[PDB]
């Protein structure tokens, strides 16, 4: 059956297609992206069945439009820096102690 | 006039069964997942995904212990010789244990108790 | 029909649609109502917005849509509907 | 009858030699273990070995191409490329089975992202 | 969605507690990766999000 | 003057919910439960139902094999521990004839095992507490003397016998 | 080395938890000692799933 | 074990080299390229 990109309009809402991190779907990405070193008198491989395009950690789910929409809805969660602390010079004055702590983001079960 | 005004009965003014009743209530809003954000939300509610911002000591509290239990372990040396060479050996032992970040207080206390025993047989 | 749909969309009310059978029944009859009373362009807008994401239509719904197109004398669109039905 | 009488297509990945792993070829498995400071690279390697063996044993003759094992925190995305020879119901049954079994084996939310192709996508011939 | 839209959306609850919040002078984010292009795209994303 | 603003606390899933509230439904795609692959997107309602049932059947077979042999999945690697991924034990652990065993079977919803244990306790002359027999009566009444998967009430079934055998009947029993 | 600096060094040892009494370095070894701290499951699982009829 | 440690007081991929090469040579080990 035919891919669904034929049904996607040219002024559709892109973030709705890929709300979150998802793999490369050539049947869902409405682009003629080609990836690969061409053979002699050849072309880079098409997207359909292309393993290399599927191996990329794509940023289709994070577009400038999507990023702006997300940050517009996440503004509700933010507080404001106390305006008195205009720079460092007052910052080590009113709050002398500095406590540095580190956190790590790895990938795995633990 | 609306159906909300008129005559009424006027009668009154102002275990396993419950478990399965609540489980049946859950089914009222049991729909298939509608997008990926919903999947992440369901997984994190189930406890599947990590909490973000990631906390490297999430789910671990060291039995609610405080630092003075980990740094000051010389109160477990009261039943030992107070001035002989076991005092030396055991004070230095507990100095070593107090610098161990991988053990909890309970293991350290059990280890000190094992030395208590071992010297007492000897 | 629009009032009921708007209530269904209010907050998390959509979770009340029930199993697949009930959802198909509800949406089929809603689209039938649209086809029988809306002016054609709104019917087509609902057709794209509901199918296939919301439910998979039955043959009778397509017959109703074709009759709506007939009443609207917009016969030009029919090949698209036949491709969709196929 | 007598001894004197008795006496190939490649995919994109098969075509390329190992020394193109960072030039033309990519990496199938992707995880942070091997980075400097990060730990459990051996555990991730063993996970990948078992996982490739199990995918190739659970979808026999369906995988057109090697897997892609991606990791985001706990998540384990198996982006595999399969064929269109076996019936779709069996794809769904196997996908459900493999996801659940791998989630209970690795104690993490495993997921599958099959990509069916009409046939193996040849790159050249060797 | 062109006509069929959600009527209202349940925003998440953000309660203004009574405790004072932590203040951070600096927050240094060191991302390590095997690919420069991935890190460049992530830099673009993070910088943009910080700007909005 | 340094005015420290107040902490804003949000439930564990607020950010995901806000991000989701940003994004609308995709009109040109099938629901998320199916694969986007063209060969795998269902074409008709019957086909969609068949695909979903096959998916659930695979999941149920996976649960069957996992629960059958917990030993191969008892190895936990994840921190924090994830209880929903551990094998579920359906076999009673208490073997001796005691009220605790009957409670265990009642919790596990083993109707026949519970009734047999109750009869063994009666034969041993052990007095069963009112709450325990009430829970057994609740199990029998809910499931109607049948093991968990309509059933028509049979006269002189196990529930009636248990009800008749109790020295004292309270409001909950009736 | 002044006597003042010695008594102060063993004071700072008391403050930071370091051994106040200098135990040379040979006896300090246990300080370091206490400073620090499946083919099967794979095998049957493949063969167990095999006779159920879902693996190879 | 612990008893042995106490009495003492009283006194990268974990694969075979070849299996590493096949996984390394096939691109199955992340980040390990050939110089």
Counting Cβ atoms within 10 Å, is residue B122 exposed (0-12), middle (13-18) or buried (19+)? exposed
Q: In angstroms, rounded to a whole number, what is the distance separating the alpha carbons of residues D74 and B49? A: 6
Annotate chain B with three-state secondary structure: CCCCCCCCCCCCCCCHHHHHHHHHHHHCCCCCCCCHHHHHHHHHHHCCCCCCCCCCCCCCCHHHCCHHHHHCCHHHCCCCCCCCHHHHHHHHHHHHHHCCCCCCHHHHHHHHHHHHHHHHHC
Distant-in-sequence, close-in-space partners of C53: CB < 8 Å, separation ≥ 6:
F25, F26, F27, F28, F29, F30, F31
8 Å CB contact between A81 and F3: no
The dihedral built from the CA positions of residue A78, A82, A86 and A91, taken in this order, carries a sign that is: negative
CB neighbourhood size of A48 (10 A): 14
Does the CB of H17 have a partner CB in chain D at under 8 Å? no
8 Å CB contact between B86 and B119: yes
Q: Please provide the DSSP assignment of F34-81 as one string.
A: S--STTTS--SHHHHHHHHHHHHHHHHHHHHHHHH-GGGT-----SS-
How many residues make up chain F in this entry? 174
Annotate F117-154 with three-state secondary structure: HHHHHHHCCCCCCHHHHHHHHHHHHHHCCCCCCCCCCC
A3 CA: distance to closest CA in chain D (Å): 12
Distance spanning both ends of chain C, measured CA to CA:
29
Q: In angstroms, rounded to a whole number, what is the distance separating the alpha carbons of residues D20 and D11? A: 14
Task: Considering only the beta carbons, identify the residue of D11, D107, D117 that sits closest to A109.
Answer: D107
Chain F residues close to D99, C-beta within 8 Å: 59, 62
Extract the tokens encoding F140. 């029998």
Residue of G nearest to H1 (CA): G37
Q: In angstroms, rounded to a whole number, what is the distance separating the alpha carbons of residues B14 and B10? A: 11
8 Å CB contact between A39 and D24: no
CB neighbourhood size of F116 (10 A): 13
Cα–chain-centroid distance for residue B63? 7
Closest CA to H21 of D45, D123, A55: D45
- Resolution given for this structure, in angstroms: 2.5
Chains near D with 3+ CB pairs less than 8 A apart are A, B, E, F, G, H
Closest CA to D55 of D33, D31, D28, D74: D28
8 Å CB contact between C58 and F45: yes
F55 CA: distance to closest CA in chain C (Å): 15
Q: Could you tell me the CA-to-CA distances from B29 to B33, C12, E7 in Å, in that order?
A: 11, 9, 19
Method for this entry: cryo-EM
B27 CA: distance to closest CA in chain C (Å): 9
Residue of B nearest to A22 (CA): B36
Distant-in-sequence, close-in-space partners of F57: CB < 8 Å, separation ≥ 6:
D93, D96
- The reply to whether residue C56 touches residue F45, judged by beta carbons under 8 angstroms, is yes
Helix crossing, C20-37 with C59-71: angle to 10°? 10
Would strands D124-125 and D9-10 be described as parallel, antiparallel, or unpaired?
antiparallel
Chain B residues close to G21, C-beta within 8 Å: 88
Counting Cβ atoms within 10 Å, is residue G33 exposed (0-12), middle (13-18) or buried (19+)? middle
Closest CA to H5 of B81, G36, B119, B73: G36
Residue F169: CA count within 13 A, CB half-sphere:
10
Radius of gyration from C-alpha coordinates of chain C: 13
Residue G25: CA count within 13 A, CB half-sphere:
0
Q: In angstroms, rounded to a whole number, what is the distance separating the alpha carbons of residues C58 and C81? A: 13
Which segments of C1-86 are extended strands (E)? none
8 Å CB contact between A17 and A25: no
**Which neighbouring-strand residues pair with D83?**
D117
The dihedral built from the CA positions of residue F86, F91, F97 and F98, taken in this order, carries a sign that is: positive
Q: In angstroms, rounded to a whole number, what is the distance separating the alpha carbons of residues G51 and G43? A: 13
Radius of gyration from C-alpha coordinates of chain G: 29
Q: In angstroms, rounded to a whole number, what is the distance separating the alpha carbons of residues E12 and F20? A: 11
Q: In angstroms, rounded to a whole number, what is the distance separating the alpha carbons of residues A59 and A22? A: 9
CB neighbourhood size of D112 (10 A): 21
Extract the tokens encoding D15. 């075509």
Chain G residues close to F61, C-beta within 8 Å: 54
Residue of C nearest to B35 (CA): C53
Does the CB of F5 have a partner CB in chain E at under 8 Å? yes
Q: In angstroms, rounded to a whole number, what is the distance separating the alpha carbons of residues C61 and C57? A: 6
Helix crossing, C20-37 with F45-68: angle to 10°? 160
- List % helix, strand, coil for chain D (3-state, nearest 5): 40, 20, 40
Q: Could you tell me the CA-to-CA distances from D106 to D92, H12, H27 in Å, in that order?
A: 21, 21, 23
Q: In angstroms, rounded to a whole number, what is the distance separating the alpha carbons of residues A91 and A97? A: 10
Does the CB of C48 have a partner CB in chain F at under 8 Å? yes
Closest CA to D45 of H13, F79, C41: H13
Does the CB of B118 have a partner CB in chain F at under 8 Å? no
Structure letter (DSSP) for residue F18: H
């Amino acid at each position: 059956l035919p891919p669904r990109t034929e049904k996607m309009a040219v002024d559709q809402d892109w973030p709705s297609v890929y709300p979150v991190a998802a793999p490369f779907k050539p049947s869902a990405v409405p682009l003629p992206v080609r990836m690969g070193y061409p053979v002699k008198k050849g072309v880079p491989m098409a997207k359909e069945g292309n393993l290399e395009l599927l191996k990329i950690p794509n940023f289709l789910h994070l577009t400038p439009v999507a990023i702006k929409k997300h940050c517009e809805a996440l503004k509700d969660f933010c507080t404001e820096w106390p305006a008195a602390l205009d720079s460092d010079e007052k910052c080590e004055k009113h709050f002398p102690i500095e406590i540095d702590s580190t956190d790590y983001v790895s990938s795995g079960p633990s | 006039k609306n159906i909300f005004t008129g005559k009424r009965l006027n009668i009154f003014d102002m275990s396993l069964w419950d478990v399965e009743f609540a489980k049946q209530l859950a089914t009222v809003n049991e729909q298939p997942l509608q997008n990926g954000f919903e999947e992440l939300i369901q997984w994190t509610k189930e406890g599947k995904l990590w909490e973000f911002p990631i906390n490297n000591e999430a789910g671990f509290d060291d039995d609610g212990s405080e630092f003075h239990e980990h740094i000051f372990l010389e109160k477990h040396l009261e039943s030992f010789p107070k001035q002989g060479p076991i005092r030396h050996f055991m004070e230095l032992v507990t100095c070593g244990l107090s610098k161990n970040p991988y053990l909890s207080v309970k293991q350290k206390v059990e280890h000190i108790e094992w030395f208590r025993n071992y010297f007492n047989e000897k | 029909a629009y009032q009921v749909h708007g209530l269904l969309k209010t907050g998390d009310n959509w979770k009340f649609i029930g199993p697949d059978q009930h959802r198909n029944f509800y949406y089929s009859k809603f689209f039938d109502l649209i086809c029988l009373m809306e002016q054609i362009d709104v019917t087509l807008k609902w057709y794209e917005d509901l199918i296939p994401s919301a439910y998979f239509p039955h043959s009778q719904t397509m017959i109703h849509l074709l009759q709506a197109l007939d009443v609207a004398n917009r016969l030009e669109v029919i090949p698209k509907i036949w491709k969709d039905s196929k | 009858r007598e001894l004197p009488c008795a006496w190939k297509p490649v995919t994109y990945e098969e075509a390329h030699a190992p020394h193109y792993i960072a030039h033309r070829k990519g990496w199938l498995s992707l995880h942070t273990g091997n980075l400097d400071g990060e730990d459990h690279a051996a555990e991730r390697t063993v996970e990948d070995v078992f996982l490739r063996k199990f995918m190739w044993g659970t979808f026999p003759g369906c995988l057109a191409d090697q897997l892609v094992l991606k990791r985001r925190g706990n998540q384990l995305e198996i982006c595999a490329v399969v064929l269109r020879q076996l019936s779709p119901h069996k794809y769904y049954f196997l996908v459900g089975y493999s996801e659940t079994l791998l989630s209970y084996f690795y104690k993490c939310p495993v997921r599958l992202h099959l990509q069916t192709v009409p046939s193996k996508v040849v790159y050249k011939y060797l | 969605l062109h006509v069929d839209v959600p009527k209202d959306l349940t925003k998440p609850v953000v309660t203004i507690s009574d405790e004072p919040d932590i203040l951070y002078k600096r927050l240094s984010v060191l991302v390590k990766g095997h690919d420069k292009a991935v890190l460049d795209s992530y830099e673009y994303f993070a910088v943009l999000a910080a700007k909005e | 003057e340094v005015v420290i603003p107040k902490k804003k606390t949000w439930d564990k899933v607020a950010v995901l919910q806000a991000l989701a509230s940003t994004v609308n439904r995709d009109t040109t795609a099938v629901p998320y439960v199916f694969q986007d692959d063209p060969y795998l997107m269902p074409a008709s309602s019957l086909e969609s139902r068949s695909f979903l049932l096959a998916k659930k059947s695979g999941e149920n077979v996976a649960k069957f094999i996992i629960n059958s042999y917990p030993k191969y999945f008892q190895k936990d690697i994840a921190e924090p521990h994830i209880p929903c991924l551990m094998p579920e034990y359906f076999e009673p652990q208490i073997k001796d004839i005691s009220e605790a065993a009957l409670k265990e079977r009642i919790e596990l919803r083993k109707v026949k095992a519970s009734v047999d244990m109750f009869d063994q306790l009666l034969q041993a002359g052990t007095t069963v507490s009112l709450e325990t027999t009430n829970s057994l009566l609740d199990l029998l009444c809910y499931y109607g003397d049948q093991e968990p998967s309509g059933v028509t009430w049979r006269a002189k079934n196990n529930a009636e016998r248990i009800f008749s055998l109790m020295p004292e009947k309270n409001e909950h029993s009736y | 080395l002044s006597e003042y600096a010695f008594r102060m060094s063993r004071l700072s040892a008391r403050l930071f938890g370091e051994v106040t009494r200098p135990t040379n370095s040979k006896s300090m070894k246990v300080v370091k000692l206490f400073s620090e701290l499946n083919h099967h499951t794979y095998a049957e699982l493949m063969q167990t799933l095999r006779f159920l009829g879902l693996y190879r | 074990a612990d008893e042995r440690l106490r009495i003492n007081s009283l006194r990268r991929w974990r694969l075979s080299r070849i299996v590493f090469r096949h996984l390394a040579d096939h691109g199955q080990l992340s980040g390990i390229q050939r110089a």
